[PDB]
Amino acid sequence: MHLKEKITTIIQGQRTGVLSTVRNDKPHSAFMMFFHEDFVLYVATDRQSKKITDIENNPNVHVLLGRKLDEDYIEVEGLASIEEDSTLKNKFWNNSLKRWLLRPEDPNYVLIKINPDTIYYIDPEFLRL
Amino acid sequence: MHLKEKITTIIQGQRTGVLSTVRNDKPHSAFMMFFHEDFVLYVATDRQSKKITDIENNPNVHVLLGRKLDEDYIEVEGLASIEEDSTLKNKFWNNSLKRWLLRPEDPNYVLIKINPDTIYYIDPEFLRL
Numbered sequence: 653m654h655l656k657e658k659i660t661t662i663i664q665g666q667r668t669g670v671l672s673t674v675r676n677d678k679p680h681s682a683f684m685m686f687f688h689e690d691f692v693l694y695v696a697t698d699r700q701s702k703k704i705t706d707i708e709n710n711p712n713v714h715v716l717l718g719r720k721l722d723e724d725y726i727e728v729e730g731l732a733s734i735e736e737d738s739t740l741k742n743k744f745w746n747n748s749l750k751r752w753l754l755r756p757e758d759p760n761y762v763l764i765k766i767n768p769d770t771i772y773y774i775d776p777e778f779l780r781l
Numbered sequence: 782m783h784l785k786e787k788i789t790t791i792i793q794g795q796r797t798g799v800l801s802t803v804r805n806d807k808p809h810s811a812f813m814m815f816f817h818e819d820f821v822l823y824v825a826t827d828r829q830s831k832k833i834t835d836i837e838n839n840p841n842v843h844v845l846l847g848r849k850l851d852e853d854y855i856e857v858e859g860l861a862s863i864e865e866d867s868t869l870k871n872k873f874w875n876n877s878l879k880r881w882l883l884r885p886e887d888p889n890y891v892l893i894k895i896n897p898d899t900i901y902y903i904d905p906e907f908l909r910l
């Protein structure tokens with residue numbers, strides 16, 4: 653059976669997805685580049701980001717990633733935390749991030765770590781993690 | 782000055798965006814086709830949709846619409862309601878909706894009406910409505 657592979661395929665493809673959070677009891681969504689270690693997703697951002705404040709107030713997040721109307725994609729539900737591990741920060745660093753961060757040593761660079769509870773594969777089957 | 786025009790340009794372009802809602806105190810986002818009357822956005826969906834239940838429980842919604850990493854787009858914050866007006870339903874009907882609805886007379890077809898409070902134009906300037 654191919655669900656983990658179908659999901660990994662999506663996660664191993666294009667990087668831009670949508671990260672949604674709750675912000676003062678209202679939804680907020682932003683385009684973000686996604687990296688990963690196995691099924692754990694990571695987004696590089698500035699530590700003063702409102703998404704970081706959102707996560708500070710409610711850790712539940714939702715991800716749409718992978719997307720013609722009939723392309724396959726995934727939806728991820730899980731809890732987020734902030735990750736400042738130098739090894740992961742240096743691993744994921746790349747020049748597209750220069751829009752928002754200076755360099756891998758920028759003190760403002762943090763990762764949002766998303767620990768998935770449920771991954772739905774659309775085109776739903778799901779994986780519980 | 783060109784903000785209303787910049788926004789209308791986005792709203793008059795490709796139709797697929799992201800509709801985010803709050804679902805049991807957690808964020809949820811879905812790809813949806815967007816229609817509009819002036820700056821009021823509408824999405825056609827099935828009346829048993831969980832997005833409808835979400836909106837039933839918290840009317841605040843967020844839209845990303847319009848999107849290369851440096852394409853322009855908009856973010857919309859506002860309150861949603863359900864619209865069953867036959868004139869609008871027939872106006873927006875088209876065959877892409879056949880994935881989710883039978884025909885314009887399908888009793889399951891409703892519109893989600895999004896009354897914007899704030900529209901941000903990204904590439905932010907904003908309009909209050």
Ligand SMILES: Cc1cc2nc3c(=O)[nH]c(=O)nc-3n(C[C@H](O)[C@H](O)[C@H](O)COP(=O)(O)OP(=O)(O)OC[C@H]3O[C@@H](n4cnc5c(N)ncnc54)[C@H](O)[C@@H]3O)c2cc1C
Nearest residue numbers: 668682683684685696697698700701702703752850901905
């Ligand atoms: C394809 C793509 C990929 C991207 N990838 C990344 C990424 O990997 N990492 C990254 O950091 N960023 C990335 N971005 C940028 C990110 O989507 C935006 O910076 C987004 O606004 C971040 O949301 P935030 O709440 O953290 O933003 P913040 O900068 O903290 O605040 C902006 C938010 O506040 C609100 N706002 C906007 N303007 C005003 C204002 N005038 N007054 C009051 N409120 C306002 C809006 O809701 C907006 O989303 C990407 C953008 C694109 C298009």
Ligand SMILES: Cc1cc2nc3c(=O)[nH]c(=O)nc-3n(C[C@H](O)[C@H](O)[C@H](O)COP(=O)(O)OP(=O)(O)OC[C@H]3O[C@@H](n4cnc5c(N)ncnc54)[C@H](O)[C@@H]3O)c2cc1C
Nearest residue numbers: 721772776797811812813814825826827829830831832881
């Ligand atoms: C480009 C694009 C455009 C689209 N445009 C439209 C549109 O205009 N109108 C429309 O109606 N739809 C549209 N869709 C489909 C829409 O995005 C999905 O149907 C989406 O899941 C709707 O969210 P919902 O909560 O209303 O879905 P519902 O069908 O009510 O429920 C599905 C949701 O429940 C959760 N779920 C999924 N599977 C399970 C399961 N196995 N067990 C428990 N929970 C589950 C997921 O979070 C999922 O989003 C579009 C899709 C794409 C890709």
